[PDB]
Design an enzyme around this catalytic site. Sequence first.
Site, short mmCIF file in Angstrom:
data_model
loop_
_atom_site.label_atom_id
_atom_site.label_comp_id
_atom_site.label_asym_id
_atom_site.label_seq_id
_atom_site.Cartn_x
_atom_site.Cartn_y
_atom_site.Cartn_z
N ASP A 145 3.22 -8.19 -31.28
CA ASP A 145 3.44 -7.68 -32.72
C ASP A 145 4.15 -6.56 -33.02
O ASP A 145 5.73 -6.59 -32.83
CB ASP A 145 1.62 -7.46 -32.70
N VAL B 172 -2.04 1.53 -5.27
CA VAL B 172 -2.50 0.70 -4.86
C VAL B 172 -2.81 0.98 -3.46
O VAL B 172 -1.98 1.28 -2.50
CB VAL B 172 -1.32 -0.59 -3.68
N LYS C 74 0.69 -1.10 -0.27
CA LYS C 74 -0.02 -0.74 -0.16
C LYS C 74 0.70 1.22 0.06
O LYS C 74 0.61 2.51 -0.48
CB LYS C 74 -0.65 0.19 1.65
N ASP D 36 4.86 -3.36 -35.49
CA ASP D 36 4.43 -1.61 -34.36
C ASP D 36 5.76 -1.13 -35.43
O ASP D 36 7.29 -1.16 -35.38
CB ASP D 36 4.40 -1.24 -33.40
N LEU E 28 2.95 2.17 -2.06
CA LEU E 28 2.78 1.89 -3.70
C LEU E 28 2.07 3.16 -4.53
O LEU E 28 0.84 3.02 -3.98
CB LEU E 28 3.72 0.85 -4.59
N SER F 74 7.68 -3.04 -28.21
CA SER F 74 8.51 -3.87 -27.61
C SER F 74 9.49 -4.52 -27.96
O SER F 74 10.55 -4.31 -27.24
CB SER F 74 7.18 -5.01 -26.80
N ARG G 13 3.64 -15.07 -29.05
CA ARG G 13 4.63 -14.45 -28.94
C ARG G 13 5.47 -14.85 -30.33
O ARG G 13 5.50 -15.57 -30.67
CB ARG G 13 5.16 -14.36 -28.00
N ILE H 185 -13.54 -8.72 -31.27
CA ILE H 185 -14.38 -9.40 -30.07
C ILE H 185 -13.77 -8.18 -28.62
O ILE H 185 -13.21 -8.26 -28.35
CB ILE H 185 -14.75 -10.31 -29.45
N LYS I 292 -6.26 -7.91 -0.51
CA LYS I 292 -6.78 -9.17 -2.12
C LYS I 292 -4.85 -9.28 -1.72
O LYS I 292 -5.09 -10.41 -1.58
CB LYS I 292 -6.51 -8.35 -3.12
N1 DTP Z 1 -3.55 2.63 -24.33
C1 DTP Z 1 -2.62 2.80 -24.91
N2 DTP Z 1 -2.76 4.51 -24.66
C2 DTP Z 1 -1.07 4.88 -25.07
N3 DTP Z 1 -0.73 4.13 -25.86
C3 DTP Z 1 -0.60 3.11 -26.49
C4 DTP Z 1 -1.73 2.68 -26.04
N4 DTP Z 1 -1.79 1.33 -26.27
C5 DTP Z 1 -0.53 1.34 -26.96
N5 DTP Z 1 -0.13 1.60 -26.82
C6 DTP Z 1 0.86 2.58 -27.92
C7 DTP Z 1 2.59 2.24 -27.18
C8 DTP Z 1 2.98 0.74 -27.46
O1 DTP Z 1 4.19 0.56 -26.94
C9 DTP Z 1 2.88 0.92 -28.76
C10 DTP Z 1 2.35 -0.67 -28.96
O2 DTP Z 1 1.14 -1.43 -28.65
P1 DTP Z 1 1.22 -2.74 -28.38
O3 DTP Z 1 1.73 -3.01 -29.12
O4 DTP Z 1 -0.19 -3.43 -27.86
O5 DTP Z 1 2.53 -2.53 -27.07
P2 DTP Z 1 3.67 -2.66 -27.14
O6 DTP Z 1 4.66 -4.06 -28.40
O7 DTP Z 1 4.36 -1.93 -26.50
O8 DTP Z 1 3.42 -4.62 -27.01
P3 DTP Z 1 3.35 -5.91 -26.94
O9 DTP Z 1 5.13 -6.37 -27.45
O10 DTP Z 1 2.37 -6.78 -26.70
O11 DTP Z 1 2.73 -6.28 -28.61
O12 DTP Z 1 1.30 1.72 -28.83
MG MG Z 2 3.15 -3.90 -30.44
NA NA Z 3 -11.09 -9.43 -27.89
NA NA Z 4 -0.78 3.24 -2.28
NA NA Z 5 0.08 -3.52 -32.05
#
Ligand code: DTP
Ligand code: MG
Ligand code: NA
Ligand code: NA
Ligand code: NA
EC number: 2.7.7.7
Length: 326
Positions: A181, A56, A51, A183, A53, A171, A140, A97, A63
């Site tokens: 994925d 939290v 808590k 990006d 942090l 990422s 992945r 979905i 929990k």
């Molecule tokens: N809800 C959000 N608000 C602000 N920025 C976002 C949001 N969702 C995604 N982004 C931005 C930051 C992410 O690093 C980037 C790519 O989205 P995403 O592919 O879902 O995540 P990621 O690349 O960080 O991880 P992953 O390995 O799961 O693909 O877009």
């Molecule tokens: Mg991504």
């Molecule tokens: Na979905």
């Molecule tokens: Na806190």
């Molecule tokens: Na993405």
Amino acid sequence: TLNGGITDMLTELANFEKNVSQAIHKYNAYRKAASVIAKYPHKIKSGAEAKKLPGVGTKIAEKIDEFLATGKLRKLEKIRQDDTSSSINFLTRVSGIGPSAARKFVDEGIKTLEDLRKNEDKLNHHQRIGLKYFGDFEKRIPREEMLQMQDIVLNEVKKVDSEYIATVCGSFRRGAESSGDMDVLLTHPSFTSESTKQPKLLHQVVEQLQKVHFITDTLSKGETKFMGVCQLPSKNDEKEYPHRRIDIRLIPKDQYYCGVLYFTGSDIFNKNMRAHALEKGFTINEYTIRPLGVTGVAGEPLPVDSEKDIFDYIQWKYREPKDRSE
DNA sequence: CCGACTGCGCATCAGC
DNA sequence: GCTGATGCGC
DNA sequence: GTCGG
Ligand SMILES: Nc1ncnc2c1ncn2[C@H]1C[C@H](O)[C@@H](COP(=O)(O)OP(=O)(O)OP(=O)(O)O)O1
Ligand SMILES: [Mg+2]
Ligand code: NA
Ligand code: NA
Ligand code: NA
Ligand SMILES: [Cl-]
Ligand SMILES: [Cl-]
Ligand SMILES: [Cl-]
Ligand SMILES: [Cl-]
């Protein structure tokens, strides 16, 4: 990880609240608490310790106390055995979905993977592709395949026009050994905040990637954002690679730093940083950082020459991409 | 206590 | 058709 | 669900 049991619990709670309760603020509260616990460098011994942090509070602390003492959370054990919650949670695992459509499908007795497969004509285009690749989309992507994918994308973009710059973000840019994925941030000097001197800039790149059979399906596509599916080529006699999700974002070239900051993430990191900006009197999106007036109205975009400039405005020490995986 | 919670592109639908 | 709201995913 | 003022 040191506190994986707790963060898994909070993540499962976040997903329950988003998917079933349709309580978006609780979803975000649980994810914030999970994130701050995940980076805490000690094995948590009590709810009171947690808590301390930010994010939290009292209810999550309780929990955590339950989970520490018993290894389980009764609230989740009940959710897991509730048919409607289980059904809805499963259906939302299909891309396209969401919580609303999941609950509508359950209402209609569409409840399992086999139900979805025999009711394809009740799915929109995105949902149809999400179902087609349901299994693949939960796998992945190893960084080594990400590098091969990067090589294709960058080279195919170059062939369309050598003035494009494509930057793999998400990422991957944060140095992850595996990604959900791919990006891709895209720029071209013809597209700036001042003018669009050339049409079809994103279309041309998508087309080329389809032409070489890299992009295989489209989930959505407009002038600046493509979301779809791709696949690495396989060799003679080798099993095919899984199909993969790919997003491409075309950003005005003079707004690259805000766009690369946004598309590098993580999502929670962006949320935290944008929240801090607001407390400092700014608002950040993928295009600009702007000051907030005394009335809460965004003013004019501030000059940005690097990612670090954005950090400087909100008085954060710079953080390399690898340190942004919140 | 209680307002506010990061920010937005594309798909889809309602109302006109 | 346009406009605006909602869903979804980012 | 949490938190700042
Ligand atoms: N809800 C959000 N608000 C602000 N920025 C976002 C949001 N969702 C995604 N982004 C931005 C930051 C992410 O690093 C980037 C790519 O989205 P995403 O592919 O879902 O995540 P990621 O690349 O960080 O991880 P992953 O390995 O799961 O693909 O877009
Ligand atoms: Mg991504
Ligand atoms: Na979905
Ligand atoms: Na806190
Ligand atoms: Na993405
Ligand atoms: Cl809520
Ligand atoms: Cl549990
Ligand atoms: Cl910028
Ligand atoms: Cl803007």
